[PDB]
Point group: C3
Chain length 287, copies 3
């Protein structure tokens, strides 16, 4: 069987270890993507764990991803923040990539906020823009790479969970209204995020495929975390920072490259911090 290497008991031990070693009790988990680790600077009463301390955690390998779990309060809300994440392209199976999401469920988290860098496929997008994720296209999932493959553990969720309501309608409505409170020249964009495995960037022909399929942005993460979160009942909210426009003609001499991506994160850090801090107020209270 191509199954989950972790048992329920493995997820439980990691959860109990974290509950022993901190007094924090997060309601919200935030996964910070490529060059968005500055979202953990505004946390009050921060307690930090390195991923290598925490039993059963995977290592973080990619530049701009620190490898640190941080508990704290963000604008009043009890939060846990993954400073850096795991990617299929680093060689991890998807049951390792998504291991933290289930641990968070067992801590008592009820809301997952997922952030990423993404390449812009919709031509109306501009570098620096923030796109709310209305929906995704899980290209690896079509082929068999789904983190729920293998035996289903009823203790987390259903054998066959729906994803047609994955991205919380209500939190999206509130973040569109709230957008007035940043007075930005640019509007809050909304669209479909497509996951591709990477780690190489898209050809022009691939870019046009993705546009034709109806995607507005592209990246190499996030979707598996969303599936596992919806499987175990988490409210999910997501956004992408558009870090580059994907090359869509043969004439251009520009090329996607990681430095440009990291650089668009340094520029946007102020705007995101403020966006996320306001978002926290729009999250429903528990129970």
């Amino acid at each position: 069987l191509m199954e989950n290497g972790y048992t329920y008991e493995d997820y439980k031990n990691t959860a109990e270890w974290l509950l022993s070693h901190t007094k924090h009790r997060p309601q919200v988990a935030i996964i910070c993507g490529s060059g968005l680790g500055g979202l953990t600077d505004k946390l009050t009463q921060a307690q930090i764990f390195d991923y290598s301390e925490i039993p059963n955690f995977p290592r973080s390998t990619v530049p701009g991803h620190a490898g640190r779990l941080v508990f704290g309060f963000l604008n009043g809300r009890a939060c846990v923040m993954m400073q850096g994440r795991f990617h299929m392209y680093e060689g991890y199976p998807l049951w390792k990539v998504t291991f933290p999401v289930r641990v968070f469920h067992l801590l008592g988290v009820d809301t997952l906020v997922v952030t990423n860098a993404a390449g812009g496929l919709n031509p109306k997008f501009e570098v620096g823009d923030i796109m709310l994720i209305r929906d995704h296209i899980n290209l690896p999932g079509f082929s068999g790479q789904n983190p729920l493959r293998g035996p289903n553990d009823e203790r987390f969720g259903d054998r066959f969970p729906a994803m047609s309501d994955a991205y919380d309608r209500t939190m999206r409505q509130r973040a569109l209204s709230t957008w007035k409170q940043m007075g930005e020249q640019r509007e809050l964009q909304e669209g479909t995020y497509v996951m591709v495995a990477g780690p190489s960037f898209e050809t022009v022909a691939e870019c046009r495929v993705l546009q034709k399929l109806g995607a507005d942005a592209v990246g190499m993460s996030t979707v598996p975390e969303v599936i596992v979160a919806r499987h175990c009942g988490l409210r999910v909210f997501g956004f992408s920072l558009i870090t580059n426009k994907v090359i869509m003609d043969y004439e251009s001499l520009e090329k996607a490259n990681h430095d440009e991506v990291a650089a668009a994160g340094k520029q946007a850090a102020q705007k995101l911090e403020q966006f996320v801090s306001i978002l926290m107020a729009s999250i429903p209270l528990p129970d």
Copy 2:
């Protein structure tokens, strides 16, 4: 470091010889029964039942509404073997396990495979309860590497590079379409393209729109691997889907795909499916 079939020729043959030893039945036609369609075995005569767990080298069905039994008998006087329950790659099985029984059926003497499944309707003219004849398929996992024929080719089964443009028998499709009049149902017999996705999660709205843009009429998580292995070894293949739900294609809808609704639409379409298959048996050729 080689990604190959974990069964040897000898494993298939051993399983086939075990089966031939423990039954007097000698099936000509194999029928694979999908989700909610296990009632297709109800009208077999002189039935003999094996549990999958008794049969050497056989995998286990882990999905609700797949009984996990191999049933030999007579359907409208034709010698059949029926898989009451099937396997899926979402369960953890490699495609070489999922398709194990198709090659066993070849070694037993079977020459025609009937595949059935439940499917989500993507074509808006389909209603819940419709039967779709599978004209063709789109093998999305196959594009990316997940093909049951990956690895060394065994010439005892078939060619290294089998064609699939003729996978679903053109003559039985003519005969089944013209035969439909024999049941005097309100809906006509639907026809279309089946697309496989791995699952086990259901589609997002954006994914539903992808599959519609690609030209699929219905979506499921099975069948295609079985059909590829069947064509590779020379089997004639006929397929159909029961449309159990319309896949959600807009953000406003309250409706959600779920297994209980799928299984219930299965049992509602019970009588009707048994009857269609029974009459279909009369259109399958004998050897010689």
Copy 3:
């Protein structure tokens, strides 16, 4: 459980040193010959042949029409190494084995990779026997995780996240087309997008239609992984396909894709292929 390249840097280095000691040839250009295109080695002078089986760490070719030899020599006065036969993921090889020679060629001092293949024509204006210059590719297995660069990156070869938008060298492409015009050719040179599918089974009609809708002009089961590895380590890349057959795009045809027709095409195209390879070799810049 970590899904990584099974070769160390020192495996590649050992294979490269072994080749450097066993031949005096010092190639600048590597050419990978695909199905039925092994005849491109005939015009090499001062040829020195190695069977893949005698070279350390080399995989084996298992497909008919792939001789399994590495040939060093001069092709039109330019120092080349030719793979007479390549490896495919459908044989069961992981993509890090499929692409193993590309990095060996880098360490031998090669600076240009030419990739050739047979392909099925999707664009209806292509005829059997056409040569299509590859302007671009669509890596369908790559979308799903089947990428030869997956796992830890070795900085000794290249970057973690390499760009592919400029993979097929534009200048070589321009020169090849100018030259073909300057010759005053009747049948103009085709240019288009190659899509990789895993195989080994050929496409259904519905699958052919999907690949047309995605913007692909030609379909095969190779090439793309080699190009990705080539670009990762700084090689200049040029590809072309021989269109060996037209992909079946309607249900009324009785034709079927088959391997025999693919070999018949290669022998038939031999003079055309030689002429094109000459044009192409004279388009490759010299080192400084």
